[PDB]
Amino acid sequence: MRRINFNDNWRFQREISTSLREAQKPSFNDHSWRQLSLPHDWSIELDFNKDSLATHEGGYLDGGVGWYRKTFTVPSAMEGKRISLDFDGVYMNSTTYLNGEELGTYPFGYNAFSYDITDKLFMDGRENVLAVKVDNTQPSSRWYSGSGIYRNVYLTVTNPVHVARYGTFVTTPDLESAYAARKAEVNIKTKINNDSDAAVQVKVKSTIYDTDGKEVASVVSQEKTAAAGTTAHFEDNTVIENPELWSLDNPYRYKLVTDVLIGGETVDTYETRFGARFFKFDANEGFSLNGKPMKLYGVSMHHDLGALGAATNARAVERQLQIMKDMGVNAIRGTHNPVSPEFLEAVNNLGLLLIEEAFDCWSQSKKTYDYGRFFTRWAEHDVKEMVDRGKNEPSIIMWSIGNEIYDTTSPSGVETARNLVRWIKEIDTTRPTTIGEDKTRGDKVNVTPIDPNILEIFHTVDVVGLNYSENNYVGYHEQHPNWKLYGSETSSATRSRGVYTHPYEYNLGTKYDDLQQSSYDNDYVPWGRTAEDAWKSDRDLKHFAGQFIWTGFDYIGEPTPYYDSYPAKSSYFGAVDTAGFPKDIFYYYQSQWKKEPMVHLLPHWNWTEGEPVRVLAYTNAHQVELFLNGKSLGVRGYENKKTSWGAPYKETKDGKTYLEWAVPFKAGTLEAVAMDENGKEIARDQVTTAGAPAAVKLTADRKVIKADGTDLSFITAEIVDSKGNVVPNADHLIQFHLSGHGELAGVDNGDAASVERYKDNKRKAFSGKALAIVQSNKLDGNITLHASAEGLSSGNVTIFTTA
Numbered sequence: 001m002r003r004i005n006f007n008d009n010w011r012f013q014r015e016i017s018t019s020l021r022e023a024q025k026p027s028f029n030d031h032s033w034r035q036l037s038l039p040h041d042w043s044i045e046l047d048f049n050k051d052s053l054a055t056h057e058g059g060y061l062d063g064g065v066g067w068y069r070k071t072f073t074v075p076s077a078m079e080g081k082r083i084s085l086d087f088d089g090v091y092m093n094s095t096t097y098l099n100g101e102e103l104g105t106y107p108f109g110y111n112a113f114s115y116d117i118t119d120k121l122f123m124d125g126r127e128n129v130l131a132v133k134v135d136n137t138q139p140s141s142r143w144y145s146g147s148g149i150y151r152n153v154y155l156t157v158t159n160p161v162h163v164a165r166y167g168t169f170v171t172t173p174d175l176e177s178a179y180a181a182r183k184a185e186v187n188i189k190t191k192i193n194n195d196s197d198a199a200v201q202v203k204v205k206s207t208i209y210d211t212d213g214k215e216v217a218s219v220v221s222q223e224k225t226a227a228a229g230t231t232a233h234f235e236d237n238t239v240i241e242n243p244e245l246w247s248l249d250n251p252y253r254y255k256l257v258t259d260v261l262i263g264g265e266t267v268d269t270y271e272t273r274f275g276a277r278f279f280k281f282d283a284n285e286g287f288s289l290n291g292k293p294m295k296l297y298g299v300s301m302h303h304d305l306g307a308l309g310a311a312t313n314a315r316a317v318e319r320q321l322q323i324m325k326d327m328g329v330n331a332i333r334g335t336h337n338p339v340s341p342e343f344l345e346a347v348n349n350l351g352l353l354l355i356e357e358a359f360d361c362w363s364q365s366k367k368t369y370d371y372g373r374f375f376t377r378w379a380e381h382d383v384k385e386m387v388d389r390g391k392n393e394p395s396i397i398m399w400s401i402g403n404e405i406y407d408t409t410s411p412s413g414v415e416t417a418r419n420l421v422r423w424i425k426e427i428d429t430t431r432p433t434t435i436g437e438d439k440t441r442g443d444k445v446n447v448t449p450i451d452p453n454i455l456e457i458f459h460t461v462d463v464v465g466l467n468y469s470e471n472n473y474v475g476y477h478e479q480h481p482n483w484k485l486y487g488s489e490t491s492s493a494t495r496s497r498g499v500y501t502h503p504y505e506y507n508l509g510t511k512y513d514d515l516q517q518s519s520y521d522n523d524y525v526p527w528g529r530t531a532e533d534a535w536k537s538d539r540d541l542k543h544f545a546g547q548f549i550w551t552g553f554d555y556i557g558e559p560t561p562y563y564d565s566y567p568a569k570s571s572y573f574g575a576v577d578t579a580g581f582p583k584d585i586f587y588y589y590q591s592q593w594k595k596e597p598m599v600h601l602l603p604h605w606n607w608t609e610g611e612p613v614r615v616l617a618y619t620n621a622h623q624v625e626l627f628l629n630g631k632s633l634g635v636r637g638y639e640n641k642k643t644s645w646g647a648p649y650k651e652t653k654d655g656k657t658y659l660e661w662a663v664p665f666k667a668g669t670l671e672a673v674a675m676d677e678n679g680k681e682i683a684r685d686q687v688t689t690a691g692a693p694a695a696v697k698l699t700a701d702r703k704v705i706k707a708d709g710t711d712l713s714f715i716t717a718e719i720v721d722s723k724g725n726v727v728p729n730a731d732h733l734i735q736f737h738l739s740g741h742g743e744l745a746g747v748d749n750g751d752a753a754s755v756e757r758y759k760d761n762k763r764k765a766f767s768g769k770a771l772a773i774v775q776s777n778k779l780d781g782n783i784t785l786h787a788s789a790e791g792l793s794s795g796n797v798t799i800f801t802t803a
């Protein structure tokens with residue numbers, strides 16, 4: 001194989017009481033060290049520590065120094081091959097050693113890096129010792145980073161003359177024009193490294209295959225010299241007749257196979273997946289993909305996977321992005337760092353657009369040990385690494401040079417901005433540059449005069465991202481009629497799943513004794529807005545390309561507004577909780593963003609007889625009729641309204657994007673019947689009063705998973721009454737017992753204020769529910785999960801694994 005999985009047979013230890021500096025030496029004794037496979041996040045395995053140097057910001061989980069070692073032999077069948085050690089990502093400030101010699105140091109925690117080890121390996125089946133020091137001295141992060149080799153590790157094995165790392169660049173110049181003539185013109189730029197000790201003459205064959213693997217185009221380059229130790233550059237054009245475009249509904253990808261030819265002999269082969277798609281940000285019309293106008297329905301996403309921590313997992317990140325697509329999302333912002341290759345694969349396969357963001361700081365640090373201290377020497381390397389990694393990915397539409405960068409008020413920030421945009425454009429000119437900027441917010445009411453340095457930075461990027469700055473959406477468009485504006489960061493409303501507090505009070509950045517936030521879209525940070533208010537400001541403007549809400553998913557750390565308020569340790573900003581369980585606001589976004597008729601009632605229906613409950617319906621239906629125990633409580637209706645250019649939306653005469661009743665509580669069944677303008681029923685939702693807790697009910701999202709050692713089944717554990725209604729406030733401790741061909745990868749409940757372990761075999765329900773994550777091993781067969789709780793009836797589910 002050209003790329004080998006190098007995840008297995010590692011040893012790990014944290015540096016605690018005594019120095020591990022000796023662990024670089026091959027001879028060091030690691031026989032007592034823990035044995036594990038990568039990927040690995042050592043922080044997520046630890047108990048929460050209220051005294052952690054990570055503070056609340058990093059979720060009260062310790063980092064510090066840790067060491068990985070791997071002792072291995074090289075097969076005879078690899079002599080005279082080029083071998084690189086490839087890390088997808090190590091958080092952070094790592095130093096790698098082979099056979100006691102330093103290969104290098106890599107500061108940045110969120111990029112891949114590679115070391116050529118061809119001339120450093122012992123090839124004779126003698127023992128090689130690889131040592132990685134990971135230095136996450138804290139505080140380094142405004143959110144939960146994780147610590148360690150949290151992404152995949154590979155060997156790349158090639159002949160001395162080979163396609164370079166990221167050695168292909170497949171583009172579709174003027175695709176709109178070509179597509180109107182029933183083709184895609186495909187431009188292919190190929191880099192060939194000659195790592196041999198002698199010049200060669202080289203040709204490149206480029207063959208394009210469709211998803212079925214039928215050849216659809218091919219082209220052979222001219223012959224070119226590649227001197228010893230140099231790169232030859234090739235550029236070839238070809239045509240796909242009647243191309244299949246990559247789109248949100250049809251995320252179709254072709255495969256380029258590159259053959260490296262020396263004297264008619266193939267010495268290397270290399271595959272590149274790519275898609276044919278065009279898009280445009282328009283200063284007056286907003287965004288379009290392949291000529292289809294649309295708003296960016298976007299979310300921000302951090303890199304953690306909840307109970308998995310930072311340790312990457314293809315199924316887990318795919319599940320996150322499936323849930324976002326189900327909310328009606330079409331676009332993601334990789335806040336605030338390059339995403340994993342598993343994340344890229346998910347947006348490519350699911351049909352989601354992606355803004356890739358390089359930096360959370362430039363030179364000026366946000367946290368003592370963040371990247372700021374490395375930026376002036378490493379920025380050019382890290383920004384080009386992001387662009388070079390991703391340039392063939394159809395999902396990526398924009399490169400962000402930074403988020404909320406303090407430097408952008410200084411002449412130093414202007415020179416940096418110009419450098420970053422120039423370095424990006426040396427790698428790729430086919431996607432706009434952007435920035436996420438918060439320092440124009442001002443008083444939140446009046447159009448803010450732009451700082452002169454920020455203004456020159458807004459002229460330097462191709463597309464201007466505003467953070468929390470609704471007061472400028474119109475004024476900046478009128479003052480700067482060639483600007484392409486979108487909301488790079490919006491709302492930051494805070495909410496807890498199944499919590500319905502201060503129903504008629506709209507509070508800014510307010511803490512409560514419950515350590516929760518309300519799901520009546522009525523808690524939000526002082527710089528932010530309600531979900532509704534951030535959306536209305538966007539909805540009403542054609543020129544405004546769309547927005548990226550803070551956030552899609554909850555993440556570990558930043559428990560705002562509970563600053564330094566242990567055990568508040570993870571976020572409230574997500575539409576969906578860390579366990580992948582939707583909050584009520586998930587249904588508000590469905591109601592604004594999706595066409596398929598839906599209706600969603602809140603709150604739950606376990607109250608006290610007589611109490612006037614605030615009842616909301618999130619719906620995209622014209623009207624809803626509410627029923628209590630089969631009797632009508634009244635119709636509520638929207639007006640069918642039109643934006644200033646005639647885009648239709650539903651809103652009440654009072655400006656609300658939701659429907660509302662005040663209901664004197666009576667136990668039983670509350671039902672919402674959603675109807676069109678003609679009174680025809682198009683959707684229904686109900687909530688029932690739950691009785692005493694009686695059972696634990698298990699539901700697997702997938703009952704059949706692959707026996708590959710990494711695939712996952714996500715098991716919901718609910719507390720139900722004797723009729724199987726979920727008990728909306730239940731908090732019972734669930735004890736999980738797994739048997740069979742699997743292990744429990746983690747447990748969670750989405751409770752921001754829990755300091756229960758993620759890496760454990762028990763978890764309290766939170767608002768009725770907990771999660772168990774089951775992982776397969778390499779042997780096929782059966783997994784059984786048993787869930788018990790004191791005084792209730794147990795739950796059981798079987799997972800089947802196929803090989």
Ligand SMILES: OC[C@H]1O[C@H](O)[C@H](O)[C@@H](O)[C@@H]1O
Nearest residue numbers: 404438439441467468526527
């Ligand atoms: O207090 C922290 C917050 O302060 C500022 O107002 C920023 O705009 C916001 O994004 C930041 O995280």
